[PDB]
Amino acid sequence: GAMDPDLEATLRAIVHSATSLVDARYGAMEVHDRQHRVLHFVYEGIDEETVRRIGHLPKGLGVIGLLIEDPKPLRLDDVSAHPASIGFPPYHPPMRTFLGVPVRVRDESFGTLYLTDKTNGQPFSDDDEVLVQALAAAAGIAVANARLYQ
Amino acid sequence: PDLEATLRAIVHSATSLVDARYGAMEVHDRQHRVLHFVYEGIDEETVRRIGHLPKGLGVIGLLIEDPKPLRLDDVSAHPASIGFPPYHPPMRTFLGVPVRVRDESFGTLYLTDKTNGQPFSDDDEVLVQALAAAAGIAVANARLYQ
Numbered sequence: 593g594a595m596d597p598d599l600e601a602t603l604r605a606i607v608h609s610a611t612s613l614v615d616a617r618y619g620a621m622e623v624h625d626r627q628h629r630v631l632h633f634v635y636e637g638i639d640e641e642t643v644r645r646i647g648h649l650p651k652g653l654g655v656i657g658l659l660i661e662d663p664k665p666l667r668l669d670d671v672s673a674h675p676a677s678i679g680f681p682p683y684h685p686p687m688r689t690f691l692g693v694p695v696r697v698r699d700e701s702f703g704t705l706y707l708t709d710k711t712n713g714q715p716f717s718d719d720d721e722v723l724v725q726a727l728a729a730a731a732g733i734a735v736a737n738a739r740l741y742q
Numbered sequence: 743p744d745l746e747a748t749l750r751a752i753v754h755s756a757t758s759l760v761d762a763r764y765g766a767m768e769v770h771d772r773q774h775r776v777l778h779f780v781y782e783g784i785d786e787e788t789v790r791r792i793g794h795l796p797k798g799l800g801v802i803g804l805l806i807e808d809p810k811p812l813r814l815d816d817v818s819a820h821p822a823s824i825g826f827p828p829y830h831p832p833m834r835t836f837l838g839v840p841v842r843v844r845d846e847s848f849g850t851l852y853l854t855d856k857t858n859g860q861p862f863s864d865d866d867e868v869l870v871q872a873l874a875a876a877a878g879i880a881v882a883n884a885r886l887y888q
């Protein structure tokens with residue numbers, strides 16, 4: 593089923609603010625179930641034709657998986673060089689710099705929020721990490737309270 | 743609290759990320775009585791001096807009547823401005839947005855006095871709207887629970 597419309601609008605707004613404020617080329621959020629299964633995927637920075645070419649949606653594998661087992665921020669300067677990296681699928685844009693955080697309320701996990709390819713070729717900053725943590729915390733509030741509502 | 747802690751956390755994110763001196767959120771019922779008023783940036787002694795809680799008048803009243811973002815270089819210069827009560831800190835720059843869901847608006851999240859005298863930006867407005875939207879879902883759920 594589709595996400596609740598208020599939740600969807602809120603999460604897209606959060607992904608947009610995060611992407612815009614950290615000057616990332618790409619931004620995404622996975623919304624999960626209680627067993628960390630991806631239920632919804634919202635993103636920005638990739639055109640419709642490229643989305644069609646890629647075809648299958650992400651399973652939340654690789655480095656994204658680390659945000660769950662180690663629920664703290666992860667910054668990398670060459671994401672697909674990490675040993676946990678599963679690699680990009682055919683037609684997916686290549687990406688290098690990465691900033692990811694879990695979306696949580698207290699210890700409860702609701703998904704992941706991540707950004708790639710800071711526009712200046714630079715690594716994501718400490719300030720970028722703090723901003724993205726705060727926005728992920730808001731996303732957690734949104735998911736937790738939409739769920740309860742539904 | 744539950745809700746109150748949530749709203750305080752959202753006010754803290756808005757105020758700290760935009761780098762404003764003061765931040766607040768008012769949540770009202772359908773007859774505009776204040777149900778929650780949470781804020782940061784003002785010391786307890788000054789709070790005691792102001793005395794009474796805001797009623798949601800002036801520029802905040804405007805935001806309740808017509809819920810859409812309002813950014814001002816000088817809040818006291820707006821035609822709807824009612825002025826501050828005695829002992830309230832002086833405040834100049836202003837950004838306020840509604841706390842809502844599609845069905846209903848519940849409150850207003852607002853910031854004043856961005857650091858270094860600067861006006862709030864379009865980026866600040868967009869960020870505060872995203873934070874407000876999360877608070878809007880929390881308020882909507884609290885009204886089901888209550």
Ligand code: HEM
Nearest residue numbers: 618619620635636646649650651652653654655677678679
């Ligand atoms: C636009 C924002 C996006 C960002 C920031 C992003 C980021 C990433 C990153 C960093 C990886 C590699 C993880 C690793 O190697 O461990 C990855 C993999 C992957 N991406 Fe994306 N991606 C985006 C959009 C998309 C879209 C729109 C699709 C599908 C239409 C997609 C499908 C996939 C798939 C299938 C994988 C393989 C791993 C998995 O299934 O989880 N991505 N993505």
Ligand code: HEM
Nearest residue numbers: 764765766781792794795796797798799800801823824825
């Ligand atoms: C620290 C965060 C705060 C912010 C950002 C803030 C901001 C404002 C603003 C923008 C106005 C509008 C004045 C106008 O229309 O010209 C106002 C008025 C007012 N404020 Fe505050 N304020 C804060 C804290 C407080 C506190 C702690 C109190 C008392 C406990 C208070 C009591 C009032 C009252 C009584 C008014 C008159 C209008 C009304 O009743 O709504 N304020 N404030």
Ligand SMILES: [Ca+2]
Nearest residue numbers: 717718719721
């Ligand atoms: Ca550092």
